[PDB]
Each structure stands twice: as C-alpha cells, then as structure tokens.
Amino acid sequence: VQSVRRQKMFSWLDKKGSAYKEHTRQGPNLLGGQGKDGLAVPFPNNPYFKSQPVLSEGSREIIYQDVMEKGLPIKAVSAKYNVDVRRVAAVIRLKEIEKRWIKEYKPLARPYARAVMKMLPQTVLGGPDQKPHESINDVHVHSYTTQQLFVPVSESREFTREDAAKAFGDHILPVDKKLRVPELIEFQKDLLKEVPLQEANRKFLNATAASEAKIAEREAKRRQAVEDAITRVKTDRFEFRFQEFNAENVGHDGRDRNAVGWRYGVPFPDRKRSQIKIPTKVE
C-alpha cells in the first residue's frame, strides 16, 4: 500500500501538476509563472533566474541570409536586431552545419525540434518586433573599476569618464572603447546634430563595414606572417614543419611564460592535487 507521502505526491501530481504532463499551449509552462517583467520563472524560490527567449527557427534564417547573401557586416546585423555579435556568429556556424546535413541527405531532428521550441519563449524578428532580443552593449566589470574611490578634486571641476579611467588605473580605458559595437555612439551623435536618419544609417553601415575590413586585414597579415616562420619540408612519409623563433627571448633570468623549451629544474607535478591532465582546448 502506498505511503501517505507517496499518496500525497500522486494527489498533487494528478490535479495541480497535471498541467505539466503534456504541452498543449505554446510558450513556457513553468512553475513560477509569469513574473513582474513578463518572463517565466522556472524555480519559484529563485525570482532572479528567468526563462529568457530563444531565437525562433525563422529568425535564425533571417540572420543567416542577411550576413551570407547580402554580405552585411556582423556588427550591423547585431545592432539591427539587437543580437550579440557572439550569438550572431554562432547562428551562422550552426546553420552551416545544417546545410551540410541537408547536402549529405542526413535526417534532421524535426520531431524533437518542434516539440522543444514550443516550451521556450521565442522572439520572431522582422516586422513584429516588440522588444530587443538582448543587450548588445554589456561591458565587462573590470576588477579595477569595482573599487570605492573618492578622489578629491576642485569644487568646479568637470570630471569625465576619461578622468575616471585614469583614477582607477593608468592603462584602463573608458566604457566608450570597451563596447562590442562602438559605432553606435558615433551614430547616436549624428542624431544630436539633427542629421537625417537615412544618412545616419548610411554612415553606420560604412563605419561597421570599414571596421570589418581592418579586422580581416589584421587577421590576414597575422596568419600570413605566422606561415612565413614555418618551413614545410615534404619527405617520403611526413611533412616536417620547422618553425623559427628567437632563442634569446627567455627573459632576464630564464623564467618566461612564452619561452620555448622544456624547463630545467622542475620535478614532474603529476602528484600534486588538482593537476589538470586533460586537453584544455580543441582547435
């Protein structure tokens, strides 16, 4: 015979918790329910954690077509739909893999995809856009900027963000240079000068587009300069890759993090606690 605790479980699970057996309605059906900001709360005791929306299937395609077909800069697509550049780049990567599967006649998880998408809040982009997907201007809280500093200055001094950065540290930059899309500030400065919106977007596209070229150029030169130091000597079986480097850059006392060689005077640390012996990155 079922115990009372078990009996109460099925009692709650039959009437109050029955609404969670099958997902009939579209959208989140969590326990916490709608909050103050219209976001479902998965755990009632924790109000801060919320079920944030996920880009709908049709939304991912729109982002993909814009970057690939129209060749628009990633920064512009991010600023347009208020999607983080790191997320826009991921959607493209994931979408490319889909094209491979479809190109290789692989079966997709359509039954699983449709079922899971009905349990998560979505944000269809385009015409019917109510709110931005996420914040594209989040700036990392640097450790230096977290300190409590009250600097004594003149009574009539114009303390600016530039002066605040120098008070926190000497090498610190203001929050105007830490943004992932710094062109927005320049775009917003045009609206303060009563510049037509049409021309304001034109300058924005050119600015972002020009910025991507510089990034690509730097990346191109880097990779081209890294392959100039490698000498590939094909042999009967393998291909030897002789990389060059300055053997004199071992610091002033031999101890340097970016040196090349097995260090002398170190016993094998295999016996130390919490010794990482797993791959740290997959290239």
Binding site: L94, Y112, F159, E283
Partner: protein, 290 residues
C-alpha cells in the same frame, strides 16, 4: 557500485532537489518550502544547511573534495550602457554637487507637489541591484556534462555524463570523452541525435505498441529505443528552459558555448532553485570550508 550517498535520491521525506526531470523530483521542487527557518540555528548550522541543499542539485555527481577547489571567489558581472547617454553626456553631471551628484528632494515632499520634478539624468535602469549571491555554482556550468543538460539534450546530469563518457559528444567536430572538459567561449559541442531522442523521448512501453502494429507525419517504427512516434518526456515542460549563455540548435542537436555565465544588474544566468539567502550562506561555507 551504488554508493551510500545515492540510497535516497528522490526521497519524499528529505525532499531534496536534484538535477533531473524525474516526476518525483518535480513534486519536491514544486512543494518545496518557501523559506527554511534559520533564526534559531547558529552560523555553522545555517551554512551547513545551505551547503546540503545547494549541493544536492549543483554538481551532485562531483566529489566534495574536487568542487571545494573548483569553487571560485571571482563572480563575473556586466553592466549595460546605452549609446544614447554616451553621446549626449560625458559623465560630468554624475559628479555635480559634492561628487556624489545633485541631491533631489525627499519622497514625502514630492507627493504634495502638484508637478513632478525633472527626472535625473543617467543610464536607463541604473539602480537595480545585481544578484552576485546567485552565482556561486557558476564554474559547474562550464562542465561539458552540465552544459549538455542545460541544452535540453539529456534528462539529467548523470545521463549527460553517460553520453560524454561513451563517446557520443564531439566538441568542435572532435570526439571528446572527458566529462570534465571546461568549455571555452566559442566551443561547439554536438550530441548524437539518437541519444538525445531516447533521453528526452517517452518510455517505450511494449504494451502500448502491441495495439499499434495492427492499427509532418512520422511512421511507427518498432525497432528503435524510444517510443514511436517520438514524443517529449512526460514532465519535460516544467524544466524546459535554456540559459542565455548558450545558442542551441534543436535540429542538429548542437550548441555553442558563447560565454561564461555572467550576472547582470537584475538577473543571473545560473539555474538555481534557491533563494539568495541560501546561496549567500553556501558561498560563505566554501570560503574556508567551515
């Protein structure tokens, strides 16, 4: 070998919260107490209580010794800064007055005034507090097995580890058989389609298929682990939620680890069914493990 710590995983008497979609766990989570009484208990008794509650869910399959070192006292956070304010103002007004800012009248004088005073100039929503307390178990979200459980690919953390150990996941297009691989920003872990369907799929009852062989759309297949036609687990809708630091693709069962879980001013990106009072106590425990 089932250890003595797993003897009572979903017990209704103890009422623990575990990282799984089991119906027994759902009942415990739903009917969990609103606030455990911690007034009479001492500081150690409060910390020990919080440790047990939080450790029953966060990294339950991780030895206490290992997590003690994994616990980091570095709680990351971000701050939203709109470009509109950046253009107009340069932060000089935030120092006007005596350094802290131009004072404003009290709240009891404003109500009497017919016309409200001009709003203070600052970023939008620049007074809400950021929940640092609810970030203690952030390092556990970097585990390859926990990240799979948060992408709704496995039914629990235990099952998510099985897929990794049995060579079913591939990080950045390469087989990864280590459930402790700490994902890096940009990595792309992809689970096998079949293992995801079985985990999230409904149980395959041989009795329900007995009357199915005689009597878009997917045909019934009696030679597959999950029940055909595939349908979500019985109680998967109560735990269906994806964090903001992941960009999953249901179709190919792949996701990208965009960044590390971060606390914003108003929310947190660490799934935790515990109030800040408990996490705050747990955080104090691991400062000196006492």
């Amino acid at each position: 070998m089932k250890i003595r710590r797993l003897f009572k995983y979903h017990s209704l008497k103890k009422k623990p919260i575990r990282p799984t979609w089991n119906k027994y766990n759902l009942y415990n989570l739903a009917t969990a107490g609103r606030e455990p009484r911690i007034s009479g208990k001492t500081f150690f008794q409060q910390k020990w209580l919080a440790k047990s509650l939080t450790r029953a869910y966060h990294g339950e399959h991780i030895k206490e010794r290992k997590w003690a070192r994994m616990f980091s006292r570095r709680l990351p956070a971000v701050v939203n800064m709109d470009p509109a304010y950046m253009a107009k103002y340069n932060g000089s007004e935030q120092a006007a007055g005596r350094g802290s800012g131009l004072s404003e009248p009290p709240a009891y004088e404003k109500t009497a005034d017919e016309k409200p005073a001009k709003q203070v100039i600052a970023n939008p929503g620049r007074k809400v507090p950021t929940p640092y307390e609810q970030m203690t178990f952030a390092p556990l979200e970097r585990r390859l097995d926990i990240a799979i459980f948060r992408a709704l690919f496995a039914s629990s953390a235990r099952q998510a580890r099985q897929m990794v150990v049995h060579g079913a996941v591939t990080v950045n297009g390469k087989k990864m058989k280590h459930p402790g691989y700490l994902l890096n920003p940009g990595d792309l872990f992809q689970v096998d389609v079949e293992r995801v369907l079985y985990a999230t799929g409904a149980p395959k009852d041989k009795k329900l298929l007995a009357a199915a062989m005689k009597a878009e759309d997917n045909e019934i297949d009696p030679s597959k682990p999950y029940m055909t036609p595939w349908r979500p687990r019985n109680y998967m809708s109560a735990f269906a939620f994806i964090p903001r630091y992941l960009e999953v693709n249901q179709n190919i069962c792949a996701a990208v680890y965009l960044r590390h879980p971060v606390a914003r001013p108003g929310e947190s990106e660490v799934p935790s069914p515990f109030s800040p009072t408990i996490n705050q106590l747990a955080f104090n425990w691991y400062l000196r493990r006492g």
